[PDB]
Design a protein around this ligand. Sequence first.
Ligand SMILES: C#CCO[C@@H]1[C@@H](C)[C@H](OC(=O)NCCCCCCCNC(=N)NC(=O)NC)[C@@H](C)C(=O)O[C@H](CC)[C@@](C)(O)[C@@H]2OC(C)(C)O[C@H]([C@@H]2C)[C@H](C)C[C@@]1(C)O
Length: 498
Amino acid sequence: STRKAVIGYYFIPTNQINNYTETDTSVVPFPVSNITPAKAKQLTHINFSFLDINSNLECAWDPATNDAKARDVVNRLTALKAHNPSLRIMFSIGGWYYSNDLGVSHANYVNAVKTPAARTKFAQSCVRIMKDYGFDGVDIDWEYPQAAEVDGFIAALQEIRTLLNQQTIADGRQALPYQLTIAGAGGAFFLSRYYSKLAQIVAPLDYINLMTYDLAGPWEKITNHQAALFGDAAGPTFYNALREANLGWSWEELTRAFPSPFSLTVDAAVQQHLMMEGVPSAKIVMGVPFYGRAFKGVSGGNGGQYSSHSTPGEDPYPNADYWLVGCDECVRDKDPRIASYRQLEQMLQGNYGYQRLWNDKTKTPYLYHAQNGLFVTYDDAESFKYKAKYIKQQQLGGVMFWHLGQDNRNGDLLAALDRYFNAADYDDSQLDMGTGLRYTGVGPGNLPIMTAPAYVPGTTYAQGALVSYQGYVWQTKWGYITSAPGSDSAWLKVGRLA
Ligand SMILES: C#CCO[C@@H]1[C@@H](C)[C@H](OC(=O)NCCCCCCCNC(=N)NC(=O)NC)[C@@H](C)C(=O)O[C@H](CC)[C@@](C)(O)[C@@H]2OC(C)(C)O[C@H]([C@@H]2C)[C@H](C)C[C@@]1(C)O
């Protein structure tokens, strides 16, 4: 019973920093003061976002940033630590806008990690920004290094870790050591870019915060849940790209690890991490969305699930038709495709025509607007019970979420996560996790415990025979085999001894 991490992004754009105020929500909708002492206590980390990498290949604020206002906002966050001596204010470098393959700063990420000298300079800039502004650690949210750049990225994290460790010693911060995290891919297509080197990536980290949300969106042909915990056989499935990663595994090893097609769920991403040797469950943090994704143009029959739709994917949103009925924040932000949980409660409570439905396979809620043909996929305090139960059962490190401003005013989502993990009186021992589709892949990092008769030399084993030998349970790939398990290619390591 180590405390689960509870990691909340605090995102504030440059224009809001530069006009920062705590008394006008039309300029800053979500000021630091909305994070009350009670919320501060429920959080373990706050990820201040986003810093960038500049063309000097250093960690830097957006250069339009007013530095005194920036320091002041950051000081308000670090003052929160007075209510909670476990609390850290991290900062994040990257995000989609800055760091995506076509993002505005993308070449800076590539070049910052490309060579030994560039990495030294970058790493030093991170620690220096951390100490100058009073942050408690470094989060990297590069979406995403491509297979060629992965060795540099790894080396960059290793170097940052060493510098963080020096800093923790210099400041005598062993009670709350400076930390290093990344925001990891939560679906196999991006994950496949660095999957083969996952143990190396995770080794220098305190946590890898899986972005296990945005698993559906307007870029797909068919509506779906953006953060299904388990799979729905009625729903779409996807090619498992991990089976083409450069792993050096055999056909049978790849097949047993990477079923395809597969359901793109939270459970899949988590298992895909656990399958790798050297990736410990305690370092894996499950991301959850504090917002819904909305689609229009959907047909009926199944609550708007798994339907074609007409939601534009362009960015910025390409006209002024704000068709997400009742969503006032969408008008403010000029995009009807995303609604905060905060806004969604209001849409459901007003006379706007939505029903709240529940998929008992995915263990996630959804809104359906029968009259206009709208579907919204989001998470709430109910879906979080199952996700928290899963976090406990799988011995994950905790939960991360984007983002704090999207909680409702009383902070019920955060409170709920804090309760499912820490409340003495909350009991989920009978919470039924459903018959949704589990990801069944097995790999070297997550072998099940098994028993079988001991291997006997001289015996002819038929295809599919199971024996135990030198700590493991092995299975013949064909028959008849007589070789000692592990000595040639005929035997598959399927389990570990009892
Ligand atoms: C101008 C523009 C946007 O362009 C998109 C296109 C670029 C899409 O852009 C958008 O959806 N924009 C909104 C993005 C939300 C941010 C959150 C992401 C997660 N990050 C986080 N949530 N991070 C986080 O929480 N961090 C803590 C993008 C998601 C996408 O799928 O791009 C794919 C790459 C796999 C392309 C580039 O190949 C894309 O694929 C498809 C879907 C077939 O579309 C075409 C092109 C070819 C098309 C030409 C480009 C668009 C229209 O699809």
